[PDB]
């Protein structure tokens, strides 16, 4: 999951950078993907706590 998201459950594992994985996941819930890319540090630090 951390390296290929959900692709390995449907076929071959396809690598993608994790920061880009998180951005697709926000898109799936109707949030525009720049919200992560411009705030990557904030989301990662808040998640870690």
């Amino acid at each position: 999951t951390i390296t290929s998201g959900w692709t390995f459950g449907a076929g071959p594992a396809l690598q993608i950078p994790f920061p880009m994985q998180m951005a697709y996941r926000f898109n799936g819930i109707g949030v525009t993907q720049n919200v992560l890319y411009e705030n990557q540090k904030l989301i990662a630090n808040q998640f870690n706590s």
């Binding site: 920061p19 720049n34 890319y37 411009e38 990557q40």
Partner: peptide, 22 residues
């Protein structure tokens, strides 16, 4: 602006209107 995202690359973005229009 392209100074907050980490990992941006420099490339040309093609606008189809500009050449034909001008």
């Amino acid at each position: 602006n392209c100074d907050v995202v980490i990992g941006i690359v420099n490339n040309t973005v093609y606008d189809p209107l500009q050449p034909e229009l001008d």
